């Protein structure tokens, strides 16, 4: 700190940081000297070494009883580092973790906007099952009515259906440019490069939501129709289906000569006969017995 | 010994094989009372 | 190194060449760099062409390979990236970008051929995956190639 | 005695290059190594 | 009634807590014996088809011997840690028991379990405890050991050359070993563990010192030139007590001024040969 | 009169939950079962009984 | 350094990254302070100390010496802090034999098995072997091995100041008139035992 720090001073620090870790843990000083070089190595614009030596402070918790001013104030560099690449679900779980101290420090100025940010870019992560578990977790908390537009954010929760992008833009231009707090909008869309990356990310989101809803409730579908529901060109549509079928996320056969495709799988006679068999057994055995015995209960209830 | 249909026998003087000849068999000549039971036989051993 | 070079002509096994270049590494380690870098580019070179998608990045991640991060390493890793991504245009762009440091091998014929057509056939299998039936001009525009060459390549790929 | 050792070790050489057939250089390499063993003691 | 096979000698090896976690990089610079032990048990247990299609009658069992502490145990530790198939071991003295004839059961059941379980590898050590030269069939005490030798030697031969069971033999003194036990068909491959002198000495130095401090100038190649045939095991002792010397002075980094007194502490073999005789 | 239940052995392996193999400390092994309140899962191979 | 420090302060060893030493041995002329240490060290904990004469182990039966030392090591593993002690190990030590008699068989068997029990396929953790013998000239190099027995400790004949302090210790229960030059007895003493 005498030389105000540069690349060379931080490189000088980087070697001896683990020496006291082999010496002794103290829960206040040693974590501070485990995290100062986190900040320095972030300033060197190095991430791989930074995250490897960051894998020591992750277990350094339960100390929050007296480490309130120190614990999550060094958590900003983990979200910065994971913001350097695409690690959206990781930093969503990070913000879900980083909520307890602002809850203790509740005033809804450094408290509410954290919740607004995390629920805002939970959407920014790709579709995922434990992502759905997390959206079940974060939904239902008694502060979400404080955000007025969260009821509009409930659209991308269940009963998916159409997500017309022009409607979203018309609804969200003000929430991106104005607001009482407005800070996550600046963090996500307010920047130039980060804003455009979030823009194309949200476009990718909404188009894959439409892919999922068409996967749920369609047998066959035409390109003119799915293009006009997608509010985008046929060529970029076919490109998106091509680069989403190589990921094997959604099974489809997007055929581009006559104009009609199917979403279904070629149907195995073993599979169809099996499905008929199991539905036959279940839904004419157990519900049949249940109906018989509740008829017995019904005649037991009234006159014998 | 195989071509001549003669019982090939060889002894190394080990003590594992000692119990197959006699209870103590302190000499070596004892071998004959079983060797003559396979009269087409040939005696061999190493250096 | 000589055995690995010489038996990399009939194109039978490169794991022998891989082992030769490995023991060349621990021979030349910290004592002979000008053989070490060319042996490293040879080892990654022979490993990639036998369908090792991520093994290039994994094997260069070792510290003994981290210490030799020269232009040959970026050449091989971007070649491996284009191979695992099938971006043939990116493959040719990387070939042009590193052509000064990609012509250094005395063996060139193994690489401007015998990997180009391979990459082309994985381009074919990556573009056929979305559809079931197509017109030829659509896929020709998608891959940015001619027709007759693609026609005959489709003939072999159906044979 | 060493002849069978040479042929077995040539087959061993044959097995370390992953080949279904032993070649003429395997035999000479094997007898060269056995000759080097003969040079020892 | 018939039963599934069972052995109690070496249950199996639960292998989750039984792996010695010894890496091939941990053993210091012994490329040779690692090479023919990979050729000996590792490759034939997997590529048995290669051995039958070349027809070079892959070895039933390989014996390892030599001076004590040349790494004969850690080789077994490493191959047991790195094997994919099953493995089993027993200390080579439990074949003598309180009562009569338990030992033949103790070898027959473990061979039966090796046959039943998998293409496994069985490790037997200290054959000198079980294989001597002469015998006195009047003690009763000896009678069990030539017996158990008898049965092991027989149950060697009960293999069809198709079962992929490999036996690895360890001992210290090869003089006591009976030659018919090492006769071809039983132990057709023998390997000695020589004391490293110069080629491997800097290698074992580097491997054992990779985990140490060695702050800026602690030289090692000045120590590789020192004569008088330092063994393999005692290098571990040198590093160990050098660290003891470093920790006694309450220093967390070993310095070069430790190693010379550390070296003269351990070896201590002064001359044992008067120079005019030379 | 009923504390005669004296002999000590060691269990070898689990055949079933009621079929067990044990070895006496004198000699021969045996096939033995258990009463229904001895925690048969607790009878690992390697314990004295 | 090996018997007390790692048992209470093991952390410095993994700070420097090496295993503490597995055991040590003592040697010297007869009666030259070994078991004083051993009956002096034995007066420290009295709960982790097992101590044998290296002679009660052998028995006329078949192999029960191996059995008893097996369960001895099992007991050592039972209570993780334990200090084992075998004195006058010559009775079990020897060099080796090429089968002169027949007792050599099972006593050497017990020896071999003891070796594989102390460093074979096991982390003998927090168990220390301290040895004692009158003459190490008749011991197996397998038992003498630095991997097997780490540090060898010699006890010599006591020095003049050492003899002075020893006799002063033995000048505890004395009744007399004190006009004694201890230096005279010290100077006349040469090559004298500790006893
Ligand atoms: N390459 C090596 N050479 C020598 N010792 C080594 C080597 N690698 C590790 N060691 C360690 O050095 C010491 C010497 O080997 P160790 O004591 O295991 O003897 P061993 O030969 O393995 O056993 P034994 O001789 O009883 O069969 C041990 O601590 C061992 O773990
Ligand atoms: N350094 C010493 N200081 C005091 N007394 C000593 C010393 N060395 C030996 N003695 C005396 O020697 C006698 C025997 O002691 P101890 O039984 O411990 O013998 P030891 O030195 O272990 O050797 P050994 O077992 O061969 O007799 C005791 O009376 C003890 O007072």
Swiss-Prot record, chain A:
Coiled-coil stretches noted in the UniProt entry, renumbered to this chain: none
Highest taxon of source: Eukaryota
UniProt family annotation: Belongs to the proteasome subunit p55 family.
Record note on quaternary structure: Component of the 19S proteasome regulatory particle complex. The 26S proteasome consists of a 20S core particle (CP) and two 19S regulatory subunits (RP). The regulatory particle is made of a lid composed of 9 subunits including PSMD12, a base containing 6 ATPases and few additional components. Interacts with ERCC6.
Modified residues (N6-acetyllysine): 69, 216
Any one of the GO BP annotations: proteasome-mediated ubiquitin-dependent protein catabolic process
Residues of the full protein shown: 153 to 456 of 456
Keywords: Acetylation, Intellectual disability, Isopeptide bond, Proteasome, Ubl conjugation
Protein name per Swiss-Prot or TrEMBL: 26S proteasome non-ATPase regulatory subunit 12
Domain PCI: 90-268
Noted disease: Stankiewicz-Isidor syndrome: A neurodevelopmental disorder characterized by delayed psychomotor development, intellectual disability, behavioral disorders, mild dysmorphism, ophthalmologic anomalies, feeding difficulties, deafness, and variable congenital malformations of the cardiac and/or urogenital systems.
Entry keyword annotation includes Ubl conjugation: yes
One Gene Ontology term, aspect cellular component: secretory granule lumen
Statement: the UniProt record of this protein carries the keyword Ubl conjugation: yes
UniProtKB/Swiss-Prot annotation, chain B:
Residue positions, PTM N6-acetyllysine: 19
TM spans (from-to): none
Location relative to the cell: Cytoplasm; Nucleus
Subunit (UniProt): Component of the 19S proteasome regulatory particle complex. The 26S proteasome consists of a 20S core particle (CP) and two 19S regulatory subunits (RP). The regulatory particle is made of a lid composed of 9 subunits, a base containing 6 ATPases including PSMC5 and few additional components. Component of a complex with USP49 and RUVBL1. Interacts with PRPF19. Interacts with TRIM5. Interacts with NDC80. Interacts with PAAF1. Interacts, in vitro, with the thyroid hormone receptor (in a thyroid hormone T3-dependent manner) and with retinoid X receptor (RXR). Interacts with ERCC6.
Record-stated family: Belongs to the AAA ATPase family.
Protein's job: Component of the 26S proteasome, a multiprotein complex involved in the ATP-dependent degradation of ubiquitinated proteins. This complex plays a key role in the maintenance of protein homeostasis by removing misfolded or damaged proteins, which could impair cellular functions, and by removing proteins whose functions are no longer required. Therefore, the proteasome participates in numerous cellular processes, including cell cycle progression, apoptosis, or DNA damage repair.
Protein's name according to its UniProt entry: 26S proteasome regulatory subunit 8
UniProt organism field: Homo sapiens (Human)
UniProtKB/Swiss-Prot annotation, chain E:
GO-annotated cellular components: ciliary basal body; cytosol; membrane; nucleoplasm; nucleus; proteasome accessory complex; proteasome complex; proteasome regulatory particle, base subcomplex
GO BP: any one term: proteasome-mediated ubiquitin-dependent protein catabolic process
Keywords for the protein's UniProt record, in alphabetical order: Acetylation, ATP-binding, Cytoplasm, Nucleotide-binding, Nucleus, Phosphoprotein, Proteasome
Entry function: Component of the 26S proteasome, a multiprotein complex involved in the ATP-dependent degradation of ubiquitinated proteins. This complex plays a key role in the maintenance of protein homeostasis by removing misfolded or damaged proteins, which could impair cellular functions, and by removing proteins whose functions are no longer required. Therefore, the proteasome participates in numerous cellular processes, including cell cycle progression, apoptosis, or DNA damage repair.
Protein name, per record: 26S proteasome regulatory subunit 6B
Species of the source: Homo sapiens
Cellular localization per UniProt: Cytoplasm; Nucleus
Assembly and binders: Component of the 19S proteasome regulatory particle complex. The 26S proteasome consists of a 20S core particle (CP) and two 19S regulatory subunits (RP). The regulatory particle is made of a lid composed of 9 subunits, a base containing 6 ATPases including PSMC4 and few additional components. Interacts with NR1I3. Interacts with PAAF1. Interacts with TRIM5. Interacts with ZFAND1.
Residues binding ATP: 66-73
UniProtKB/Swiss-Prot annotation, chain F:
Organism: Homo sapiens (Human)
Subcellular location: Cytoplasm; Nucleus
Described purpose of this protein according to its UniProt entry: Component of the 26S proteasome, a multiprotein complex involved in the ATP-dependent degradation of ubiquitinated proteins. This complex plays a key role in the maintenance of protein homeostasis by removing misfolded or damaged proteins, which could impair cellular functions, and by removing proteins whose functions are no longer required. Therefore, the proteasome participates in numerous cellular processes, including cell cycle progression, apoptosis, or DNA damage repair.
Record's subunit section: Component of the 19S proteasome regulatory particle complex. The 26S proteasome consists of a 20S core particle (CP) and two 19S regulatory subunits (RP). The regulatory particle is made of a lid composed of 9 subunits, a base containing 6 ATPases including PSMC6 and few additional components. Interacts with PAAF1.
Family: Belongs to the AAA ATPase family.
Protein name in the entry: 26S proteasome regulatory subunit 10B
Modified residues (N6-acetyllysine): 23
